[PDB]
Amino acid sequence: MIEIKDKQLTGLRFIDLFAGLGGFRLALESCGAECVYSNEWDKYAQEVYEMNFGEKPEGDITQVNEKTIPDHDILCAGFPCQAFSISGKQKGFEDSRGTLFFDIARIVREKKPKVVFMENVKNFASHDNGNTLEVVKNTMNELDYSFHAKVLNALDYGIPQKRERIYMICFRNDLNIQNFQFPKPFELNTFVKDLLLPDSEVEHLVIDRKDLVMTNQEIEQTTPKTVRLGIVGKGGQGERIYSTRGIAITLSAYGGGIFAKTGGYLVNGKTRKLHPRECARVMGYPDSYKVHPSTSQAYKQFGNSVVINVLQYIAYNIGSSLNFKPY
DNA sequence: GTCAGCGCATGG
DNA sequence: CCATGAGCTGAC
Ligand SMILES: Nc1ncnc2c1ncn2[C@@H]1O[C@H](CSCC[C@H](N)C(=O)O)[C@@H](O)[C@H]1O
């Protein structure tokens, strides 16, 4: 993550819904805001959260009375993506994991917060011929909010990963905010090769397969794009090998392949997958964030998360707009 | 609960 | 034509 000197959000309160690892909390606390409630149902996600932050999040959001929830200024939520992702079956609102949005709307109507900050995958914007995005937009307008949305690739904001998400920001209509803007891009100066651990710590992750086929030669100069060097098996998900001189592919949570969830990379003559700590780094997490003791769950957790840096830049801008109140 | 072979929509 | 994806499904 990056360091913020001008703490634009001091004094405001927020809630962490679908908490996961607490990615929304790190970003917002770095700007001076305060957390007053959290909710996450996964047994193991709850353990890591407690380890790092010191409190257990409440359970199942679908059976919590919206009036119990504390008064807050910003609502944060990165709702489930399985029913909308391009890697799934695309069942949308007919999937029991696709209706979560409406519990958000339910909470919103009661607490009427100042800002609503949501985020999902790129295909969310195109699903069902744009109908799904329309439904979210109209419900927000009807509740008296303005809707601002955009798709941002992580490689444009300092982190070496091709990870495209859609961000949705909503301000209550009586605040009359007319100057919010999505952050401007810059040049990338860090590559996969700058975050790797020493060879002695990652020896156990090596894989020597006899069906390895090199289709491209290693490159000699860095570039901001995924460079594919080879394949194993039929070249499906988890069977593709890339260069450490380019950028990483999107990390996932339920993926397969011999190089499951992270993909394979050509490191010093060898082919291996990433270590959990190296995953933390490509997601923007600091080396002081304690990871889960079980390697298996650690990978799933990081693949469901958000990239800190992008959230930080957007949070600064939300505060700047709120603080501009001239005579 | 963990592991790995897979098969298709989307966007050029 | 060619490359990708906060996935699915069945095995133990
Ligand atoms: N009904 C429900 N109640 C609470 N949490 C739920 C839920 N259904 C799914 N979830 C949780 O929603 C999360 C979706 S992914 C969100 C990750 C989070 N932004 C982070 O910073 O890491 C997962 O942790 C999932 O277990």
**In chain A, what are the domains?**
1-186+285-327 (3.40.50.150), 187-284 (3.90.120.10)
Catalytic residue among A35, A81, A170, A279: A81
DSSP state, residue A169: E
CB distance A313 to A157 below 8 Å: yes
- Both structure tokens of A97: 């994991």
Cβ atoms of residues A117 and A74 within 8 Å: yes
Residues 6+ apart with CB under 8 A from A296: none
Distance A98 CA to B12 C1' (A): 28
Say what the resolution is, in angstroms.
2.9
What would the two tokens of residue A216 be?
A: 């491209």
CA distance linking residue A169 with residue A110, whole number of Å: 19
| Experimental technique | X-ray
Distance CA A295, CA A155 (A): 27
CA distance A188 to A225: 11
Vertex A281, ends A209 and A195: CA angle to 5°?
65
Contacts of A189 (CB under 8 A, 6+ apart): A158
Compute the distance from residue A172 Cα to the ligand 1 centre, in Å.
25
Give the whole-angstrom CA distance, residue A278 versus residue A298.
12
Q: What share of chain A is helix, strand, coil (3-state, %, to 5)?
A: 30, 20, 50
Pick from A52, A3, A18: which is nearest to A305 by CA?
A18
Q: What is the DSSP string of A203-235?
A: GGGB---TT-EE-SPPPSS--SS--EEEE-TT-
Instruction: Please tell me the distance between residue A82's alpha carbon and the centre of ligand 1 in angstroms.
Output: 11
Q: Is A170 a catalytic residue?
A: no
- Ligand 1-lining residues (CB < 6 angstroms): A 18-24, 39-42, 45, 60-62, 78, 80, 304-306
- Dist. CA A80 → ligand 1 center (Å): 6
Q: Which helix (H) or strand (E) holds A312?
A: helix A308-323
Concatenate the DSSP letters of all residues of A101-159 into one string: HHHHHHHHHHH--SEEEEEEEGGGTTTTTTHHHHHHHHHHHHTTB--EEEEEEGGGTT-
Give one DSSP letter per residue of A257-282, joined into a string.
STTTTT-EEEETTEEE---HHHHHHH
Six-digit token pair at A225? 């794009």
Token digits of residue A308: 């800190």
Pairing of strands A115-121, A74-77: parallel
Closest by alpha carbon to A263, among A279, A253, A278, A274?
A: A274
Query: In this structure, are residues A93 and A133 in contact, taking their beta carbons and an 8 Å threshold?
Result: no
Task: Give dist(CA A177, CA A14) in Å, integer.
Answer: 19
Contact in structure between A212 and A232 (CB atoms under 8 Å): yes
Identity of residue A12: L
**A200: nearest Cα among A275, A294, A288, A287:** A275
**Nearest C-alpha to atom 1 of ligand 1 is from which residue?**
A60
Tally Cβ neighbours within 10 Å of residue A327. 2
